[PDB]
Amino acid sequence: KVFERCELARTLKRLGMDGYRGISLANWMCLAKWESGYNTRATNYNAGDRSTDYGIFQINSRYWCNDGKTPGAVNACHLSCSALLQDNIADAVACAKRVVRDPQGIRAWVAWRNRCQNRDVRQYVQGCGV
Ligand SMILES: CC(=O)N[C@@H]1[C@@H](O)[C@H](O[C@@H]2O[C@H](CO)[C@@H](O[C@@H]3O[C@H](CO)[C@@H](O[C@@H]4O[C@H](CO)[C@@H](O)[C@H](O)[C@H]4NC(C)=O)[C@H](O)[C@H]3NC(C)=O)[C@H](O)[C@H]2NC(C)=O)[C@@H](CO)O[C@H]1O
Numbered sequence: 001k002v003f004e005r006c007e008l009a010r011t012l013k014r015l016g017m018d019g020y021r022g023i024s025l026a027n028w029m030c031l032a033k034w035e036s037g038y039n040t041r042a043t044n045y046n047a048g049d050r051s052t053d054y055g056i057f058q059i060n061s062r063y064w065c066n067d068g069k070t071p072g073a074v075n076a077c078h079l080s081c082s083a084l085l086q087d088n089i090a091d092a093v094a095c096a097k098r099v100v101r102d103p104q105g106i107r108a109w110v111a112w113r114n115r116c117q118n119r120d121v122r123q124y125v126q127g128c129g130v
């Protein structure tokens with residue numbers, strides 16, 4: 001499913017992502033836009049590691065979900081990776097909260113670092129009334 005910007009913003013707000021671990025909703029929205037284009041079906045295979053990034057937040061199988069085919073991986077979110085390719089994003093949100101709590105924090109997300117860091121991100125939430 002491809003979420004519309006404000007639809008996702010509303011959802012994330014409701015699921016308490018606004019200010020989570022001090023991260024603003026605008027940052028979370030920026031992250032989702034550049035990681036997957038707000039697409040729950042997005043997958044990215046990393047041929048040089050045999051890991052896969054899944055869903056709206058592009059959560060990596062080496063550490064966070066079990067996909068059964070990533071060599072030497074762990075499953076810190078205690079979820080099948082398949083659960084991150086769903087229309088309901090409650091599981092993806094719970095996992096993103098776990099991810100941000102690792103030492104690295106929001107730096108775990110490469111697209112965030114490249115397109116959102118050190119920028120004014122108010123645009124990803126404009127006109128959403130969140
Ligand atoms: C080819 C490419 O770049 N593809 C991108 C994906 O890599 C990327 O997903 C992110 O992948 C990185 C690298 O594996 C991963 O970062 C790792 O995170 C783990 C878990 O937090 C770290 O291990 C922890 O380290 C701390 C301190 O060293 C320990 O205290 C702790 O015990 C460890 N945790 C666990 C559970 O064991 C790794 O050190 C760290 N590695 C690096 C190099 O930073 C990110 O978490 C992945 N991000 C997400 C959201 O899954 C994907 C998304 O950015 O994008 C592709 O482009």
Ligand SMILES: CC(=O)N[C@@H]1[C@@H](O)[C@H](O[C@@H]2O[C@H](CO)[C@@H](O)[C@H](O)[C@H]2NC(C)=O)[C@@H](CO)O[C@H]1O
Nearest residue numbers: 033034035036037039042043044058110111115
């Ligand atoms: C212009 C734009 O919003 N592009 C979106 C892409 O960012 C996104 O591709 C992702 O790009 C990230 C860097 O911007 C990469 O870190 C990441 O590997 C890549 N994700 C995938 C799944 O390839 C795509 C993906 O849906 O959507 C574009 O709209």
Ligand code: NA
Nearest residue numbers: 061065073074
């Ligand atoms: Na795994």
